[PDB]
Write a protein that binds this DNA or RNA. Structure first.
Ligand SMILES: Nc1ncnc2c1ncn2[C@H]1C[C@H](O)[C@@H](COP(=O)(O)OP(=O)(O)OP(=O)(O)O)O1
Ligand SMILES: [Ca+2]
Length: 341
DNA sequence: GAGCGATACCGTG
DNA sequence: ATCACGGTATCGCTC
């Protein structure tokens, strides 16, 4: 099959740049402000102008201001991005009925039955970059190859505003040459677990014995890596249906006082129930990030759907259970709803 | 031996 | 020192 992946460049920033074009050329950093102290929080994304200097998603806002104190610092407007994203997405549906929306920012199309070869495919990805630039003034990167993983690796290798095909010969090349840590799904913890085992390239997972590999990363990621290195990975493009929806909020100050967490918790329920629309969940999970930045949950499933009032009273019970069964103070509290009708 | 909710870990956005 | 999603490993229960 032939897979075409679209990955919007610097999406949150670029949307801010489309809306306020005075911003082009300047470093923009979309932030998520927390409210413990002035400029506490983290970076959600920056544009290339800011990324050049080490201002990337995940760093604290204070560090980003130490590097680029004169950049534009914008509060995250996710609702807006989500709305633009939706419209870019309804636009990708013109090019294939088989479409898998992977994130706010990313979609895969199986165009197998709308092109014959990768030159036709390549051609369809210029069209699509054009259409999106025309309608929404947003640059994207396209990656084309014979499955989702190598279509995503192609986009990585081509961004920003790129397009690249990874034909069957280049796939065999990468399986040998490409550092396994750049394979989607291999993050730092498992990258290291591999290097530990000498695994540096994908091909390497075929000489190692399966249960040494399984015993180290998981049967599933083991099988995942092996199927790639055998060039036998095919995962169909499948439509995403959201499974959970939650919200966590950081408290002005740590605590384990029940009457002190309760308003943040209840704020988190309100927000999440609004984010649910007509989705009725049967499961609720309360979520506390410890003072130590660990994450510890407590949940309950129900024969029925969960009303907000059920949500309010069950969540307090679940938070009580978090505080008994642990001694660590709470930095942020939230909830996740799931198992929808 | 292996199928099921709770819960943690791990990846990416 | 953000928030969000969602896949998989592990346990204990259960057949
Ligand atoms: N750590 C993060 N926290 C919050 N939002 C994030 C984080 N990483 C990425 N995002 C959001 C903002 C990005 O616009 C969008 C897509 O991410 P990604 O493709 O990794 O980066 P990019 O589009 O900024 O280049 O996801
Ligand atoms: Ca992107």
């Amino acid at each position: 099959m032939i897979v075409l992946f679209v990955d919007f460049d610097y999406f949150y920033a670029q949307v801010e740049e489309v809306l306020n074009p005075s911003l082009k050329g300047k470093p923009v950093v979309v932030c998520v402000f927390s409210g413990r102290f002035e400029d506490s929080g983290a970076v959600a994304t920056a544009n290339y102008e800011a990324r050049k200097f080490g201002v990337k998603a995940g760093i604290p806002i204070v560090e980003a201001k130490k590097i680029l104190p004169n950049a534009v610092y914008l509060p995250m407007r996710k609702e807006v991005y989500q709305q633009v994203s939706s419209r870019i997405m309804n636009l990708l549906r013109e090019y294939s009925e088989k479409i898998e929306i992977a994130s706010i920012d990313e979609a895969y199309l199986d165009i197998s039955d709308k092109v014959r070869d990768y030159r036709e495919a390549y051609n369809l990805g210029l069209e699509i970059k054009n259409k999106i630039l025309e309608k929404e003034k947003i640059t994207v990167t396209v990656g084309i190859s014979k499955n989702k993983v190598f279509a995503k690796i192609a986009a990585d290798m081509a961004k920003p505003n790129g397009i690249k095909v990874i034909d069957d010969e280049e796939v065999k090349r990468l399986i040998r040459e490409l550092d396994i840590a750049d394979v989607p799904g291999i993050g730092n913890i498992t990258a290291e677990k591999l290097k530990k085992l000498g695994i540096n390239k994908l091909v390497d997972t075929l000489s190692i014995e399966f249960d040494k590999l399984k015993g180290m990363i998981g049967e599933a990621k083991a099988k995942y890596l092996i199927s790639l290195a055998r060039d036998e990975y095919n995962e169909p493009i499948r439509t995403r249906v959201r499974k959970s929806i939650g919200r966590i909020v950081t408290m002005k100050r740590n605590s384990r006082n029940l009457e002190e967490i309760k308003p943040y918790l209840f704020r988190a329920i309100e927000e999440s129930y609004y984010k649910l629309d007509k989705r009725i969940p049967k499961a609720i999970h309360v979520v506390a990030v410890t003072e130590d930045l660990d994450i510890v949950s407590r949940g309950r499933t129900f024969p029925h759907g969960i009303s907000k009032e059920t949500a309010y009273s069950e969540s307090v019970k679940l938070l009580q259970k978090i505080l008994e069964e642990d001694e660590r103070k709470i930095r942020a509290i939230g909830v996740r709803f799931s198992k929808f009708i």
